[PDB]
Design a protein around this ligand. Structure first.
Ligand SMILES: *[C@@H]1O[C@H](CO)[C@@H](O[C@@H]2O[C@H](CO)[C@@H](O[C@@H]3O[C@H](CO)[C@@H](O)[C@H](O[C@H]4O[C@H](CO)[C@@H](O)[C@H](O)[C@@H]4O)[C@@H]3O)[C@H](O)[C@H]2NC(C)=O)[C@H](O)[C@H]1NC(C)=O
Ligand SMILES: *[C@@H]1O[C@H](CO)[C@@H](O[C@@H]2O[C@H](CO)[C@@H](O[C@@H]3O[C@H](CO)[C@@H](O)[C@H](O[C@H]4O[C@H](CO)[C@@H](O)[C@H](O)[C@@H]4O)[C@@H]3O)[C@H](O)[C@H]2NC(C)=O)[C@H](O)[C@H]1NC(C)=O
Ligand SMILES: *[C@@H]1O[C@H](CO)[C@@H](O[C@@H]2O[C@H](CO)[C@@H](O[C@@H]3O[C@H](CO)[C@@H](O)[C@H](O[C@H]4O[C@H](CO)[C@@H](O)[C@H](O)[C@@H]4O)[C@@H]3O)[C@H](O)[C@H]2NC(C)=O)[C@H](O)[C@H]1NC(C)=O
Ligand SMILES: *[C@@H]1O[C@H](CO)[C@@H](O[C@@H]2O[C@H](CO)[C@@H](O[C@@H]3O[C@H](CO)[C@@H](O)[C@H](O[C@H]4O[C@H](CO)[C@@H](O)[C@H](O)[C@@H]4O)[C@@H]3O)[C@H](O)[C@H]2NC(C)=O)[C@H](O)[C@H]1NC(C)=O
Ligand SMILES: *[C@@H]1O[C@H](CO)[C@@H](O[C@@H]2O[C@H](CO)[C@@H](O)[C@H](O)[C@H]2NC(C)=O)[C@H](O)[C@H]1NC(C)=O
Ligand SMILES: *[C@@H]1O[C@H](CO)[C@@H](O[C@@H]2O[C@H](CO)[C@@H](O)[C@H](O)[C@H]2NC(C)=O)[C@H](O)[C@H]1NC(C)=O
Ligand SMILES: *[C@@H]1O[C@H](CO)[C@@H](O[C@@H]2O[C@H](CO)[C@@H](O)[C@H](O)[C@H]2NC(C)=O)[C@H](O)[C@H]1NC(C)=O
Ligand SMILES: CO[C@@H]([C@@H]1OC(C(=O)O)=C[C@H](NC(=N)N)[C@H]1NC(C)=O)[C@H](O)CO
Ligand SMILES: CO[C@@H]([C@@H]1OC(C(=O)O)=C[C@H](NC(=N)N)[C@H]1NC(C)=O)[C@H](O)CO
Ligand SMILES: CO[C@@H]([C@@H]1OC(C(=O)O)=C[C@H](NC(=N)N)[C@H]1NC(C)=O)[C@H](O)CO
Ligand SMILES: CO[C@@H]([C@@H]1OC(C(=O)O)=C[C@H](NC(=N)N)[C@H]1NC(C)=O)[C@H](O)CO
Ligand SMILES: *[C@@H]1O[C@H](CO)[C@@H](O)[C@H](O)[C@H]1NC(C)=O
Ligand SMILES: [Ca+2]
Ligand SMILES: [Ca+2]
Ligand SMILES: [Ca+2]
Ligand SMILES: [Ca+2]
Lengths: 388, 388, 388, 388
């Protein structure tokens, strides 16, 4: 087996087609299913896997109470084949309240963070064994992507942040070979706050669209040079911005370089990718809450500041339904690299108070060069039918 | 591994022998089992798999209420080794309220349809990745076989329909290579309505026996030429007709060419196959409801219009028990290709109203050249023992 | 992979050592576990599997009521790796209320009998496909070994009986190559009634120790010549007889040739094997009921009529606990063939009437050339703790 | 596949990083999970597995009552991939109330002890078959490591004891090749009582840190020469002793040679390993009970009698939480052999009497040459939420 290089052109897509749905919450009402959040998808050269951070409990279980909280020692990284719900036979791959995983063509890398808020540990597990670890450098919630890392020619890269959630933080980009950290680069460029990067291979480098939790409702961009380890960063050009919260479309802005200072505080993990001058992106339908999910192409959204002409919109989850995090993953085809995305469908607290837990299901779409119709694929559970 | 060509003669059979039974509904009364309908079977070169469309819920689960409905966003294609019940570790292969699957000798193809009735999307997944998609062409419930597609020399074919369920519709035959649609041929010939084809390899081509939901209780036949993509169609000759509803045997007719206009509206998915001038077929025992199931050979049933001489009858499910959809699948043996079939055993609504759900189990038989006895192999659940 | 020839000498054993226990009934009180009976064990060249006839239901399930009955259409052959309890993910390999399975070194053969008492069907499934079938020849409960068949050089043999349970019956020995019946030999010799043979390879032939349900509490022997298909039969010489019911040790007899007419009617499946002039055998401890289980070597038990000197006794299940069927299986070692056995531990009806079901667990022992101690390994469930 | 030689240098470590956690008890409150104790971890050349002794029952099950007891016939060795909780699909590998397992590079060896206290049997299972067995030599609870054995060049060694738990006993070191005992060496050296050895490869030999249940709160050391089968033994030099119970640090002693006679009776399974003159070790935080868990390096802890200079302490489980047994396992990396350890987290009786059962979960850490922070990773179940 050979290392992945991702050295094919990006598939020319017309939009996205339905790929997977796990129905986790509906099933939790009649079966033993893990409580999770922060899911993502990543594929080895043959097949795709779904990941999520468990809460060390199933849903119909008194331990599900108060699982809205982000970090406990019992959170572990769950990994199943895509479409297999997180049942009790699910393997816990490592201890983690923040994680990233990727396959370099030969084996899986998992980056797993756990421990005290002020002094966390990131473990690097490769081909089923612990190879390296690093401790918190800013003593303030060391944290990473919550989606797939990217490997080119045996070197994988992952973005990690330590420091304030609402101010200048310390972001670093790690380069990892067979689980061993070989280089660490500081963030450089004009992005002012970076969290939860959704990264994809863009040979010969890697590109990430992230979350600015401080001053921007426009999404930061991080560009990683795999050859000399140099880093650059900026903001997505599109005037149709990707974060939540954000201003409405008529009053949102981005200049490609700075956070827009428009309802910039807080945010949600999301994604986007460039195609020439244009941009494919997803976002919540609601500008204030994690409700609904839509994708579209912005004409000039990559190259033209404040561009707002969109086309090829698709509703993924209608605005009467809860969404959550979303992220990108890439899949190598015969002659091109396709882009896919997942969206987290969060149920329970804080939005739905009949129950005491917080969990999620997922829905997954992949780029297509063919044609498609319309629909909406929400979580689908009836909150009144759930164990509280 | 090589592409399948199915280039062996058809096995000479004397009837069918018991092969598999999953007992899904009996088990659902004491375990967490998926609610499903529209099951089918298909084998890779090594082993057989059972498929079905989940309802995004288990049976003992409040979400099982009102699962009689055909199309919701939460339906997904389930896939297990044949004989493994749909428990919570079952993989959901794609999002689908209509589907077909087949293995070309190298990898699995799944065709999965979901979304809005008037604007559905068909996804084509090959070797674990989304390769193509197509949108609705008549804006009226794009739909496909609900049984295995057939591949010869790396080209797979699947029959799809869009348009009226009770009038002229738009049926097309897709040719697919490694997940990519390479050609689409319109239906041609004298079949006037085509749904839910049960197809089998008949080298060098493919033959399908389908459901006419409009004017015929005789089953349409679709012949597919894999070399030039040409299509022909007609109706099964046998005067013992295969649809439900239908006239009783003394007053049923087929002329091989036209729908018989005998209780033609509505129908059920079924199968038949030719052996020279003769026909092997199955059908429900009841002529008006999906109750019981029988198989038999009709002498001259392939070649002689209105032939009604049967022999080698076998009861599969006695008429005091519910059946449902049925379909064919083919299995390559050492020197010949065998024909097998499955029967969907529907329990719950609308026929049994003590419970609020609709689900099924399955029973499976394979052609034999040996001898056999008699029996009946129904679902076997006691409706009074079930969670409602 | 090559066909098995079993052409190594038999292991010299000093007794048996603990190998496996599944604890099915204890687990059934807190988990979804199949109701089964008539288990057995068989190994491919790499690993062992446990088999049993399911009753189409789990134990904590209203359908478990009245599972004391032997034959219903919902019984299927279950197959797991040895030591994996029959949970809901268990594969049902075929439809069967009587079965036998074996691996020829290349693939599995399953012989599965189901259908009407007076007209049953045996299906032969090889390498995952139905290859042959045969119908009842005496119209009276066609039935087979309920333990492993034996294959030498690609030809597998299995013993089947059709006819009276309490009088002359029609026993036949089938020879099967890759699932295809190639020859059928009538029983010959002096055994007067043959059921439920426990067979083992004894190169160049196969030897079976069976159950006489008519006139003998001494066990019949069937010898199968794999080269010319000839059959011989007689009775185990040992004066310590293996069936239940039977006379006490002081008044039991066997002459090697005829049924002993000592509490001969009824019986239980059991096993024995020869070592030179001596005999290793197991049996219930109770002479009248399926209670307890013991193994020992009878000096001259193979060659000397009415021999009663035993040595190397081991209690497997003490007499205060229920047992049931037992059978032999053989395992190829580096330089010899080992013999192992399982015993079925029956719980519920008819002996324990607090509950309405009948099920079993298993315990498994293997021949050893080493040393060992003592113990008792019964089912271990508390009938008062069970769902009724 | 080749035999393991473990012929690489030991990894230089700075401490330990989080590796795995199974959350067994939390999950048991909402799912069917095995009752277990005496867990351990061992890896084949590709991946790691978790083992434990089941109690033949799930936790939410009336049979979980009184599972504090050490030895019943229903205990079996469970084996899952590391991180997969012991659900109902878990394989029971053999019958055992004491065990050890290891992989020699080609196949798994399991050593399984069961039966009567005064006459137990040890079974040796290699590559899925029973190869050897040995009976009790002192008629007083034959028992072994409860952690991984170690194989070099096709010879596996395991430490077994028979005799008094509180006085002179009979300890022997077995040498095993493909499951067959080829040599047995008596314990030699100055260790006066040996139980539950935690062994690791230290090419060309094997080293074990054990439990003295009689006179020492310092841990015995056993050195095994794999070339001539010679044995040596002594006690860990460190004045910071590893057993529980023990004296406080100010008044604890070890002279490297004799048991210290400081709260020597009783004990708990634990581990340590050498790095030059220094010692890495773990122990409960409490000196009297199985509460808390800490690791640290003792400068001169291997070579300097009574050394008490520690550095690089890490809390693994804070002292407000229950621990239990702990043990070492070794993982071969690209250029070195790493050392890892697991901690058993015991819940229920005798410490927590709200419930009537005794079970455990596990947490697992691996050596790292990188950096790390702080935390505590206890079982995490709320005893008040548990089925009693
Ligand atoms: C059947 O399905 C197809 C495919 O999904 C669908 O065609 C699509 O329709 C949408 C909506 O009209 C198109 O996307 C739009 O493109 C225009 C530019 O041409 C944009 O202006 C639109 O954005 C505005 O309107 C949106 C609401 O529709 C707002 O949310 C947004 O803020 C803007 O105000 C939007 O991007 C899309 O291009 C086509 N896709 C293709 C491939 O043609 C079709 O309509 C469906 N038919 C029915 C009747 O369901
Ligand atoms: C033991 O099992 C065997 C094998 O299943 C069984 O033999 C079969 O019997 C049936 C019924 O007699 C045969 O099928 C019939 O064939 C005749 C032509 O020879 C047809 O006329 C029959 O059709 C008419 O009758 C049917 C009801 O039986 C009606 O439903 C139908 O509409 C027609 O009116 C029917 O097809 C079959 O050929 C044999 N099979 C073989 C291989 O011989 C046997 O009877 C069983 N024995 C017992 C006592 O159970
Ligand atoms: C520790 O375990 C060992 C191994 O299990 C055990 O040694 C065995 O003891 C039994 C019982 O004494 C021996 O089997 C006996 O052999 C004699 C002939 O030498 C027979 O006469 C015995 O049969 C008679 O007695 C039986 C009851 O014991 C009756 O059931 C039977 O009907 C006969 O009347 C019996 O076969 C066996 O040979 C040894 N095994 C070996 C290898 O030595 C030992 O006793 C155990 N120690 C203790 C004290 O538990
Ligand atoms: C963030 O995490 C890091 C890494 O875990 C942590 O650094 C570690 O701190 C501990 C505690 O200070 C160090 O271990 C100590 O080393 C000294 C020798 O230098 C020993 O004397 C200590 O033992 C004494 O004190 C213990 C209590 O701390 C007693 O239990 C013991 O009996 C002795 O009296 C102890 O071994 C360790 O070396 C460092 N690790 C590294 C690699 O630097 C750091 O403190 C954390 N920061 C915060 C604010 O949480
Ligand atoms: C399944 O859902 C149905 C429909 O919601 C439930 O029956 C309804 O109950 C409401 C309120 O009690 C009535 O007003 C409706 O008339 C009922 N609908 C029908 C068509 O009868 C039913 O209770 C649910 N079943 C279960 C087991 O919860
Ligand atoms: C198992 O089934 C039997 C038979 O139905 C049940 O026993 C019967 O219960 C019915 C219904 O109340 C009574 O009318 C009969 O008198 C009973 N028959 C006998 C033979 O006593 C039994 O209750 C069922 N067991 C369980 C646990 O449901
Ligand atoms: C677990 O088993 C114990 C022992 O049988 C049960 O406690 C006993 O209950 C009996 C009957 O009331 C008393 O007479 C004994 O004194 C109790 N034993 C002890 C040690 O207290 C207990 O009820 C069982 N637990 C559960 C949850 O069923
Ligand atoms: C603390 O909040 C951060 C993360 O935010 C959220 C959320 O749903 O918004 C979920 C995460 N949950 C987990 N990954 N477990 C957080 N991240 C962490 C490390 O808590 C945020 O990005 C600010 O730094
Ligand atoms: C709408 O009815 C169609 C299908 O019919 C039925 C039925 O049990 O008859 C089940 C399917 N259920 C699913 N495949 N989910 C339907 N087909 C669809 C696509 O709904 C029919 O063939 C007429 O067009
Ligand atoms: C009818 O009884 C026969 C079989 O006996 C028994 C038993 O526990 O004794 C279990 C079987 N149960 C199943 N195998 N299912 C039977 N065999 C059959 C075919 O019923 C007996 O050997 C006489 O013929
Ligand atoms: C009897 O106690 C021994 C073992 O003790 C412990 C314990 O938690 O301390 C658990 C074991 N439980 C199991 N291994 N099942 C015991 N060992 C046995 C064989 O009982 C001890 O080391 C003294 O000899
Ligand atoms: C869940 O925990 C909360 C907070 O501690 C408490 O207020 C509430 O009563 C609990 N709810 C349930 C369902 O037990
Ligand atoms: Ca923001
Ligand atoms: Ca019709
Ligand atoms: Ca008898
Ligand atoms: Ca001690």
């Amino acid at each position: 087996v050979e290392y992945r290089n991702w050295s094919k052109p990006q598939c020319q897509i017309t939009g996205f087609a339905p790929f997977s749905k796990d129905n986790s919450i509906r099933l939790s009402a009649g079966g033993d299913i893990w409580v999770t959040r922060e899911p993502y998808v990543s594929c080895d050269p043959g097949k795709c896997y779904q990941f999520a951070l468990g809460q060390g409990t199933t849903l119909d279980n008194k331990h599900s109470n108060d699982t809205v909280h982000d970090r406990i020692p019992h959170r572990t990284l769950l990994m199943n084949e895509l479409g297999v719900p997180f049942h009790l036979g699910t393997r816990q791959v490592c201890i983690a309240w923040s994680s990233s995983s990727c396959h370099d063509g030969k084996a899986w890398l998992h980056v797993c963070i756990t421990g005290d808020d002020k002094n966390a540990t990131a473990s690097f597990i490769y081909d089923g064994r612990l190879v390296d670890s690093i401790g918190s450098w800013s003593q303030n919630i060391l944290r990473t992507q919550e989606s797939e890392c990217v490997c080119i020619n045996g070197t994988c890269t992952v973005v990690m942040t330590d420091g304030s959630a609402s101010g200048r933080a310390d972001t670093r980009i790690l380069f990892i070979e067979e689980g061993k950290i070989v280089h660490i680069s500081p963030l450089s460029g004009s992005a002012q706050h970076i969290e939860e990067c959704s990264c994809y291979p863009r040979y010969p480098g890697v590109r990430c669209i992230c979350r600015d939790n401080w001053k921007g409702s426009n999404r930061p961009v991080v560009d990683i040079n795999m050859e000399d380890y140099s880093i650059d960063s900026s903001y997505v050009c599109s005037g149709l911005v990707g974060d939540t919260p954000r201003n409405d479309d008529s009053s949102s802005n981005s200049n490609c370089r700075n956070p827009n200072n428009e309802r910039g505080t807080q945010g949600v993990k999301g994604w986007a990718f460039d195609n020439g001058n244009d941009l494919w992106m997803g976002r919540t339908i609601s500008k204030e809450s994690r409700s609904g999910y839509e994708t579209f192409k912005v004409i000039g959204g990559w190259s033209t500041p404040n561009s707002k002409s969109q086309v090829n919109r698709q509703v993924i989850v209608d605005n009467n339904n809860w969404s959550g995090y979303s992220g990108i993953f890439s899949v190598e085809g015969k002659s091109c690299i396709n882009r896919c995305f997942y969206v987290e469908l969060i149920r329970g607290r804080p939005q739905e108070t009949r129950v005491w837990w917080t969990s999620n299901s997922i829905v997954v779409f992949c780029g297509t060069s063919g044609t498609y119709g319309t629909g909406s694929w929400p979580d689908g559970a009836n909150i009144n039918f759930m164990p509280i």
